[PDB]
């Protein structure tokens, strides 16, 4: 277990994003789904050049799960996943060149009254908007080139640890949101299914929500797109 501070610019970026989307919190789920989609594209593109790419997990899905009792929301993809060093660098620092650009266009647009939600989506920085609804964000990731690890943060710092549960994802990433008290509605299946549907019509991968039929109850993955 290693402890880390966020880079200064990521602290600023977190605040810009939270402020930009404060009255549209639900866009957090849009961005998590987009990130999962990009991750599935990446492994799909890798499988064109590497016969083993999918060996760790033969599926390509996004699977969402509400856990009312533990107050958790889980967004799981079987995409490319992240190595330990990518968990640290990609989430904890300004890692790409596009991210800096985003910082400039965001502040210029935000002073000029121009729309910013598109900026967040364009540059793929929406991960941080999970903090509008969660007190704790947890990222479990398994990448073909590393062992499974857990990233966790309350936004005031983050830590990364080897997952003691070993390789349970096979390949891919689970974003786990410890929801704020004011965000318990994101644990309701009807809420989540409408949002998931709303945000997944463009995803070139199937997206499922763990749902109940129903005194007899049957739970199963329900395709959303
Ligand atoms: C740039 C703003 C924060 N950085 C990310 O979201 C990056 O983290 C990684 N990331 C986030 N969610 C991911 C996922 N589900 N699978 C793989 N990488 C992911 C991607 O490299 C994103 O560019």
UniProtKB/Swiss-Prot annotation:
Protein name: Endoplasmin
Primary subcellular site in the record, as a coarse category: endoplasmic reticulum
Substitution effect: residue 31 to A: Loss of ATPase activity
Sites bearing Phosphoserine, chain numbering: 100
GO CC, one annotated term: sarcoplasmic reticulum lumen
Domain notes: The SRT pseudosubstrate motif associates with STT3A during translation in normal conditions, preventing glycosylation of facultative sites until HSP90B1 folding is completed.
Organism: Canis lupus familiaris (Dog)
Subunit note: Homodimer; disulfide-linked. Component of an EIF2 complex at least composed of CELF1/CUGBP1, CALR, CALR3, EIF2S1, EIF2S2, HSP90B1 and HSPA5. Part of a large chaperone multiprotein complex comprising DNAJB11, HSP90B1, HSPA5, HYOU, PDIA2, PDIA4, PDIA6, PPIB, SDF2L1, UGGT1 and very small amounts of ERP29, but not, or at very low levels, CALR nor CANX. Interacts with AIMP1; regulates its retention in the endoplasmic reticulum. Hyperglycosylated form interacts with OS9; promoting its degradation by the endoplasmic reticulum associated degradation (ERAD). Interacts with CNPY3.
Glycosylation sites: 35, 145
GO biological process, one term: protein folding
Post-translational modification: Phosphorylated by CK2. N-glycosylated cotranslationally at Asn-145 by STT3A-containing OST-A complex: this glycosylation is constitutive. In normal conditions, the OST-A complex together with CCDC134 prevent glycosylation at facultative sites during protein folding, thereby preventing hyperglycosylation.
Residues of the full protein shown: 73 to 337 of 804
Function: ATP-dependent chaperone involved in the processing of proteins in the endoplasmic reticulum, regulating their transport. Together with MESD, acts as a modulator of the Wnt pathway by promoting the folding of LRP6, a coreceptor of the canonical Wnt pathway. When associated with CNPY3, required for proper folding of Toll-like receptors. Promotes folding and trafficking of TLR4 to the cell surface.
GO molecular function, one term: ATP-dependent protein folding chaperone
Assigned protein family: Belongs to the heat shock protein 90 family.
Subcellular compartments: Endoplasmic reticulum lumen; Sarcoplasmic reticulum lumen; Melanosome
Residue numbers of N6-(2-hydroxyisobutyryl)lysine PTMs: 96
Superkingdom: Eukaryota
Keywords: Acetylation, ATP-binding, Calcium, Chaperone, Disulfide bond, Endoplasmic reticulum, Glycoprotein, Hydrolase, Hydroxylation, Nucleotide-binding, Phosphoprotein, Sarcoplasmic reticulum, Signal
Residues that hold ATP according to the record: 35, 77, 90, 127
Gene name of the record: HSP90B1
Tissues expressing this chain: Detected in heart muscle (at protein level).
């Amino acid at each position: 277990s290693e402890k880390f501070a966020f880079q200064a610019e990521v602290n600023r970026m977190m605040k810009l994003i939270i402020n930009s989307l404060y009255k549209n919190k639900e866009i957090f789920l849009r961005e998590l789904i987009s990130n999962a989609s990009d991750a599935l594209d990446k492994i799909r593109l890798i499988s064109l050049t590497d016969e083993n790419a999918l060996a760790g997990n033969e599926e390509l899905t996004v699977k969402i799960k509400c856990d009312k009792e533990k107050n958790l929301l889980h967004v799981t993809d079987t995409g490319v996943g992240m190595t330990r060093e990518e968990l640290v660098k990609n989430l904890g620092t300004i890692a790409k060149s596009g991210t800096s650009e985003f910082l400039n266009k965001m502040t210029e647009a935000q002073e000029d009254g121009q729309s910013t939600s598109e900026l967040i989506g364009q540059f793929g920085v929406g991960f941080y908007s999970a903090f509008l609804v969660a007190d704790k964000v947890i990222v479990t990731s398994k990448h073909n080139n590393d062992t499974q690890h857990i990233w966790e943060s309350d936004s005031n710092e983050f830590s990364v640890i080897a997952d003691p549960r070993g390789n349970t994802l096979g390949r891919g990433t689970t974003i786990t949101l410890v929801l704020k008290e004011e965000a318990s509605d994101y644990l309701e299946l009807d809420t989540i299914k409408n949002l998931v549907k709303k945000y997944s019509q463009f995803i070139n991968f199937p997206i499922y929500v763990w749902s109940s039929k129903t005194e007899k109850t049957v739970w199963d993955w329900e395709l959303m797109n």
